[PDB]
């Protein structure tokens, strides 16, 4: 065998490529868009649906919907369209020769992984596959075997702690607040500036505002008083129609939802308390190495200043006689994929695949007695 | 103090009166009309602008514009003219003795409420004021403290779920489709009968057609097939020039835009799905009392048969093991004003006003830390 | 200043007088006649030209020509002779002390009004002047501010719709068919009785036949069949030489040209259809008040039975569910002058004059940016 | 099948020809004239009605009337005479062998398209037909699939936004101001020079003045001040009798009605604001390509300098950080016909005709469910 496919199906983006590579060769959004309007010039390249980058380019006339919602595939008819887009148009490979490596979040429903396995063998006919946990791959991309991982993507935020290669599944804290809910809260608090974003095509306009104008304030209540003298905390954004918008305290107030989830109305804890509660559910001896290895991942942890407040606010919870080290790599948008590329190229992993002859004798129940 | 003023500045009409009354003493449209013509006979009572009922009578020579558009006051020079018409010519009171009660929609821009507060203290010099929420007052007029309120007026449609007096601001679904957009869609689909209504003076002719010839079909595709045998579903209307028109399927097809917003080209859900999506964003425990208390309000919910389809189509979305009760009072055109009259007469409310000495030291930012 | 002059320069007659008077003190025809014969007895008061009533008396030896043709002054050398006759011989006043009020028709050429202004300042030296519209003054004489005005004099027929003192200049219809063309058609259809009227002195003989023998038939095709038994519809007229003439169907057939302009070969509508087309070019809201106020004026509308057919035939065009009221005052030969006498005696009009110091700084272009 | 007929029934002209040709083989006005006079020499080829070019030659003795008025066929007895003139005298083909392609304006009455379909199958008996939209065919003639189309012809001005072959029918702005109303306004403002054009035979004399003496001023108020020194902005025209007329500011003041519709008394926006309001009703993502593709069409957009002011005045409304490209082809009088010739010659279109066996089973309601 030459290579192996590593397909990280996130809620927002699809990262895909080959094992051994240090960067995915296919990054495109998880969008399947149907045209909503009439259509008069029938022909000249009008498809029934648009997937990925072509749905992002033609997004004005399309109803964009994402098949993966909070890490759970709810649109299996359209998730097959993204995989059909992935292997045949973004990578130009046939899946019959390459073993694929899929990922998913922990504490996921069992019907999600059983149908990822069923489609990869019956539709695409892979030689073998494997479904890994995203937070465990992200720790392995950083060259560690010990550390609690804050993987926060577009659909889910989870907090898997790992000590010396042993997962502690009773301490995994799955939170369904991620970059999608911070986008939907930014759409809510831009209406108080008279900025109406309503359709799902302006959902990516507000998402692009969030990716280049939002930051995490070190102290939120002192930053709100600074924004009362609204001069220095205001930046302008260029809308695609040529309009400009001026946002002030809305820059730092939507990443505050990661730390105060009561803004979108969730009876829940912040990402700093669910990190602290996940350490305090582990054993007393291994906490010394978990406060020292706080690896962040995903795209939601790419805010300017999120690692500074993450250290500043766990230290307010942890006992002061020990150190807190937040690990923020610069490549952590792709660290779940990078850990998948190292894993699929290991020689000690080559006997841990789920082959075709193991699937048809035991059905879909083979995929649950393999992980953890 | 004897009485207080309750001014409901809707997008279409202005309701105004006194606290304790059961009906407003001043109902007139939110119209400021300028003359568009020459004016040869200079004098004999030709004013520069006509406001309210006098602009509705002289509407054939006036360009009618509304200062409130989708619940947002965009014409602050002309909104003061309606308030100058309201307190001085419709109520004949001086605002220096009476505390006023204004209303607005939720998820409104912050500059809208600040300039309502600034004009009511600097121009009219009220003793105290308070800006309430329209859907919360409509529930309080119905004698309830629990229920989701579909307040669809002339400018905006919005759902506010309230449970035991606690508002859930993360579940408020604001939708800018309302009775104005159903008037502009009825103007669009009367052109297929050869009926040309173009200027803003025929905008109230088409609006008057809508208020007495339109109904909500219980099943739309069966009603369109019934209207193919176009005999029983046609009624005639008397235009002011003596002409008669005959409208058929256009009677029930413009209130269908409330339930299918794709007719006017909005990627949005109907009023039945934004009600269902607003209940499903509330907590699982309180949904039992929200499906049972569906209070409707505003003038747009006054169609014949709108409560019957609202119950028929939430039931298709809600689980069948529980009951749906759409509450449609017969006085629900004024229910936002009625709840404002009960609120301004409460003795437990008299300490919740925003007085003049609270405004001049704290500026316009006092009015945002008072509501919700 | 005590008084002000009101000079209505019609095509047929000159009405002149003072403001405040209820009747003009000078009514004489717009005639300047030159002698066409030898004149052997040189002297004894033989003037070079005869103006007004003295030309109507000596008309047998004169070539009578009218300087105002279809409301347009084409003979400015001879229009000054009528004005010189008017101020100095019919009113016996000097124009240097009295501000004059001139009138003209709508949709008139700009060189007509600029030369009325130039002659009234550079020849007669009035203190101030104003050129008004004839049909707007006729509505103001009737005490109305709303109504479409069928003004039909000797030179032109024109409709002006006015609503609440606001003229609608896009809906002004102007029709050059008037009482002069009905005189020239009566001269044509008297030749089939062998009555030869050829020169311009018999033009006033036929005009005097028309003013006391012509009537408007209620139904024309039934009246033509009634005149087959040519006994009851014939009346005799006394020519100035002593001859008698007997006219039958020619009594009602020339006022039919007002309603059927194809008799004199004009591709045009009647006065009932140009009234209806001028209402239907107005806005649809004000049509209810325009069908109910049909003020007629001029001398051409003095036919017996013109108001009965005007109501009978607009009703055939207007929708039947509304009323048509033709307003035919008995003084409507002078209603253009009467409205000018009320206007020049107002106090709100005294600042709307065109004074001498406004004319010499802006030239003749001052007179267009004040009226319409 | 050899060819297909493309008959563009405009309000002013009839363009007809064959599919594949680059120019129509039949251009003649939509005029049916009846003789209004006696006709003493009975015989020698005096027909009862004259259609098209033969009515334009004999127009002095005819009452010319238009069956198509504001894009609505109101004279179905006389519209069949133009089609009978078209296939049998201008093209010399029998319609039983050729499938025809008709056009009409958007937001047209339903009875207009049904009677086009009924007459083409019952009277002329075509094999198949299709009724298209005029503005969509004009964009397709320019080789584009994306752009907003200002198709201003003789009866109607309408904007249609099209993005990549998907029409947005909620953003179509239809305006009933076109070249006929600019002709009727020019007849009105030539009367202030003393030029009396009244009958319908001088309606084409004034129309021929407009087609070769009228231009669009870049700035209107500076051009009116330039015309005060009335030397350089005056040109002469040769009337058919031999008279010459000198027009000054009336050259550029009637195409100003396209940009200021208040001159003819319409509460409406100009063609630059209805273009801008139609873009601002589209989605934010597609506006970048609609401001860059402003395709104009029709004969009314053939004024010298209309594309320069169209770019100058949308730029005053659009945000300044983007480009506005008005597309003005030199062949845009026939671009609605050219796009119909390309469409009827396609092979992907040959299954979209409305055949005879589809019409007789479903009646005239087939023609509405095969558009947009
Ligand atoms: N550079 C950035 N800065 C801030 N936020 C970002 C950035 N890039 C992505 N995001 C947010 O993170 C989410 C993308 O995370 P992603 O890496 O796609 O996770 P997944 O692939 O698991 O969905 C998006 O919703 C986006 O809003
Ligand atoms: N009796 C009625 N039946 C149906 N629709 C109505 C009726 N009265 C008003 N409407 C519609 O509702 C709107 C008025 O709602 P209104 O109570 O004035 O709300 P708001 O005061 O918040 O503007 C108008 O646009 C009108 O078209
Ligand atoms: N009493 C009358 N009956 C019928 N026709 C009349 C009468 N008086 C005048 N006319 C006609 O009307 C015309 C005079 O109209 P007039 O009032 O002089 O208008 P103007 O002053 O604008 O010329 C004359 O041509 C005459 O033929
Ligand atoms: N060369 C021209 N320059 C200016 N205006 C023109 C020209 N040709 C035609 N027009 C005006 O455009 C109108 C004709 O438009 P046309 O292309 O016939 O549209 P349609 O075929 O849809 O009626 C006429 O009313 C005429 O006044
Ligand atoms: C289901 C699962 O957790 N798989 C998984 C994830 C990550 C990871 C990293 C490094 C590894 C080294 C050797 C073997 C395995 C096996 C499974 C595995 C990993 C590794
Ligand atoms: C801003 C706001 O929502 N005000 C508001 C609305 C409605 C309402 C109803 C009943 C109440 C009883 C007691 C106190 C208050 C206070 C505010 C208020 C209400 C009431
Ligand atoms: C040019 C013009 O139309 N002047 C005009 C005509 C008639 C009329 C009647 C009554 C008026 C009352 C007040 C002011 C004016 C001013 C001009 C005027 C009139 C009046
Ligand atoms: C009803 C209608 O809009 N038909 C229409 C108009 C224009 C147009 C242009 C180009 C096309 C290409 C392929 C197919 C079709 C089909 C219908 C059609 C068009 C086209
Ligand atoms: Mg991820
Ligand atoms: Mg309201
Ligand atoms: Mg007169
Ligand atoms: Mg055309």
From Swiss-Prot, chains A, B, C, D:
InterPro entries with a match to the protein in the record: Actin (IPR004000), Actin/actin-like_CS (IPR020902), Actin_CS (IPR004001), ATPase_NBD (IPR043129)
Compartments in which it is found: Cytoplasm, Cytoskeleton
Any one GO molecular function term: ATP binding
Modified-residue entries (Tele-methylhistidine), positions: 70
A family per Pfam: Actin
Keywords assigned: Acetylation, ATP-binding, Cytoplasm, Cytoskeleton, Hydrolase, Methylation, Muscle protein, Nucleotide-binding, Oxidation
Positions of modified residues (Methionine (R)-sulfoxide): 41, 44
Modification type N6-methyllysine: residues: 81
Reaction catalyzed: ATP + H2O = ADP + phosphate + H(+)
PROSITE patterns attached to this UniProt entry: ACTINS_1, ACTINS_2, ACTINS_ACT_LIKE
EC id: 3.6.4.-
Principal cellular location given in the protein's record: cytoplasm
GO cellular component, as recorded: actin cytoskeleton; actin filament; stress fiber; striated muscle thin filament
PTMs per UniProt: Oxidation of Met-41 and Met-44 by MICALs (MICAL1, MICAL2 or MICAL3) to form methionine sulfoxide promotes actin filament depolymerization. MICAL1 and MICAL2 produce the (R)-S-oxide form. The (R)-S-oxide form is reverted by MSRB1 and MSRB2, which promotes actin repolymerization.
Miscellaneous comment in the UniProt entry for this protein: In vertebrates 3 main groups of actin isoforms, alpha, beta and gamma have been identified. The alpha actins are found in muscle tissues and are a major constituent of the contractile apparatus. The beta and gamma actins coexist in most cell types as components of the cytoskeleton and as mediators of internal cell motility.
Oligomer status and interactors: Polymerization of globular actin (G-actin) leads to a structural filament (F-actin) in the form of a two-stranded helix. Each actin can bind to 4 others.
UniProt record similarity statement: Belongs to the actin family.
Its biological purpose: Actins are highly conserved proteins that are involved in various types of cell motility and are ubiquitously expressed in all eukaryotic cells.
The protein, known as: Actin, alpha skeletal muscle
Species the sequence originates in: Gallus gallus (Chicken)
Organism classification: Eukaryota, Metazoa, Chordata, Craniata, Vertebrata
């Amino acid at each position: 065998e030459t290579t192996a496919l590593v397909c990280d199906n996130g809620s927002g983006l699809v990262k895909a490529g080959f094992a051994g590579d240090d960067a995915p060769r296919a990054v495109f959004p998880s969008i399947v868009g149907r045209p909503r309007h009439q259509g008069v010039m029938v022909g000249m390249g009008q498809k029934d649906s648009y997937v990925g980058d072509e749905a992002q380019s033609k997004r004005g006339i399309l109803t964009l919907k994402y098949p993966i919602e909070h890490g759970i595939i709810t649109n299996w008819d359209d998730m097959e369209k993204i995989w059909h887009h992935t292997f045949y148009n973004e990578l130009r490979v046939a899946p019959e020769e390459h073993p694929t490596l899929l990922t998913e979040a922990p504490l996921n429903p069992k019907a999600n992984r059983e149908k990822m396995t069923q489609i990869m063998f019956e539709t695409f006919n892979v030689p073998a596959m494997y479904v890994a946990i995203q937070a465990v791959l992200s720790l392995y991309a950083s060259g560690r075997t010990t550390g609690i991982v804050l993987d926060s993507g577009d659909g889910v935020t989870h907090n898997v702690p790992i000590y010396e290669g042993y997962a502690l599944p009773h301490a995994i804290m799955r939170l369904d607040l991620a970059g999608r809910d911070l986008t939907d809260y930014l759409m809510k608090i831009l209406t108080e500036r008279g900025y109406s974003f309503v359709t799902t095509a302006e959902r990516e306009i507000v998402r692009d505002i969030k990716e280049k104008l939002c930051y995490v304030a070190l102290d939120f209540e002192n930053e709100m008083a600074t924004a009362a003298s609204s001069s220095s905390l205001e930046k302008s954004y260029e809308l695609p129609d040529g309009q400009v918008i001026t946002i002030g305290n809305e820059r730092f107030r939507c990443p505050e939802t990661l730390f105060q989830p009561s803004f979108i109305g969730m009876e829940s804890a912040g990402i700093h308390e669910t990190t602290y509660n996940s350490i305090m559910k582990c054993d007393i001896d291994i906490r010394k190495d978990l406060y020292a290895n706080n690896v962040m991942s995903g795209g939601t942890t790419m805010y300017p200043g999120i690692a500074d407040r993450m250290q500043k606010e766990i230290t307010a919870l942890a006992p002061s006689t020990m150190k807190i080290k937040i690990i923020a790599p610069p490549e952590r948008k792709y660290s779940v994929w990078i850990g998948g590329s190292i894993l699929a190229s290991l020689s000690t992993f080559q006997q841990m695949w789920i082959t075709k002859q193991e699937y048809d004798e035991a059905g879909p129940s083979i995929v649950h007695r393999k992980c953890f």
